[PDB]
Amino acid sequence: NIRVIARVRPVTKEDGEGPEATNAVTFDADDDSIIHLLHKGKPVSFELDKVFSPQASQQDVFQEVQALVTSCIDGFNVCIFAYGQTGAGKTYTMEGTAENPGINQRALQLLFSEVQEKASDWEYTITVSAAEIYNEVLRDLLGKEPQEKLEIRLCPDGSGQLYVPGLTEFQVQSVDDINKVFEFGHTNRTTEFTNLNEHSSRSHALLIVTVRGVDCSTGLRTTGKLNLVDLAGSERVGKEGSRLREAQHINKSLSALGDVIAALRSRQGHVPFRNSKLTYLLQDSLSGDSKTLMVVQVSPVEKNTSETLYSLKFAERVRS
Ligand SMILES: Nc1ncnc2c1ncn2[C@@H]1O[C@H](COP(=O)(O)OP(=O)(O)O)[C@@H](O)[C@H]1O
Ligand SMILES: [Mg+2]
């Protein structure tokens, strides 16, 4: 149910030239689950569920996702997380570019094509919401300025399921529709009266896709949730006051996410969902028969081996 993989991005301009850009990440010839880090002259090795090299394409990465996405059609819930330091490629993996679309566009494209193949008795509705978690505050990335703080409430039917009053939902039917939603989101982040955080690297951004089906011949209903999560950057911040508090919020929320996934993966009795807004919000898409994919992004170069080490230790911790 719970899988942890790493993606090593290629060298970027930010990596520079000279000794700092020397390669530090190598691999095993036979086992694609192994990653080797050279850290301050000493080798450290890690085992994950799968490791993607700097040659891995967006399509290669999506092969880890396509089966999860089709299960949402059937009513399963899924979370996909991108984790790692700012600059390691989280947004590239999740959103991609026009020339190289990421997981978000490929997942929605696959949902639309799967829906189009269902029998004529079925009616599917696909909607998207987008939310920001900044310093444990939840706001609607697609909401009207000034965006209020949102509450996470228990459904009043006693099911124990959670909902977010006032979170906006956009109906989408095509990749062109989702592109229009994403463009609106980008513009909406920096309006004059916004309460959204300008620095995307310091907040968790969640794209919540809801897939609702009804078999119109019987009234049978399915509800699948696909949560596409571009996490705040994990890098350590050297010792603002407000910058430090922000870094501490991020550290505690990411650590809580790791605690929750590790507890779920090991099928321990107590899963501490309540310890963070992110894990509490997503608990119905993490527990039970839900499926989770954690994608740990790392830089390949010597300059970043401290943060690569921290990121890969996080990956091994949640695996386990
Ligand atoms: N797999 C990849 N292939 C090519 N370029 C990448 C890849 N991952 C990241 N990049 C590039 O690295 C830079 C930082 O990536 P970004 O997605 O902004 O990282 P993050 O969201 O983790 O801060 C961007 O310029 C992006 O184009
Ligand atoms: Mg980013």
Numbering used by the authors: 445 to 683, 687 to 767
Tell me, in the authors' exact words, what the paper reports.
Kinesin motor proteins hydrolyze ATP to produce force and do work in cells. Despite their diverse functions, the kinesin proteins contain a common motor domain with highly conserved or invariant sequence motifs that mediate basic motor properties, such as microtubule binding and ATP hydrolysis. Here we report a new crystal structure of human kinesin-14 KIFC1, together with new crystal structures of Drosophila Ncd, a KIFC1 orthologue, and human KIFC3, a divergent KIFC1 paralogue, and an analysis of the structural features of the proposed KIFC1 AZ82 inhibitor-binding site.
The new KIFC1 (2.25 Å) and KIFC3 (1.85 Å) structures were determined by the Structural Genomics Consortium. Both proteins were crystallized bound to Mg-ADP and are reported here for the first time. In the case of the KIFC1 human homologue, KIFC3, an L5/α2/α3 pocket is visible, that again is smaller than in kinesin-5, similar to the size of the pocket in Ncd. There are no other interactions between loop L5 and helix α3, consistent with the open conformation of the potential binding site. Several residues of the KIFC3 α4/α6 pocket are present in similar positions as in kinesin-5, including a tyrosine, Y757, that in kinesin-5 (Y352) is thought to stack face-to-face with the benzimidazole ring of BI8.
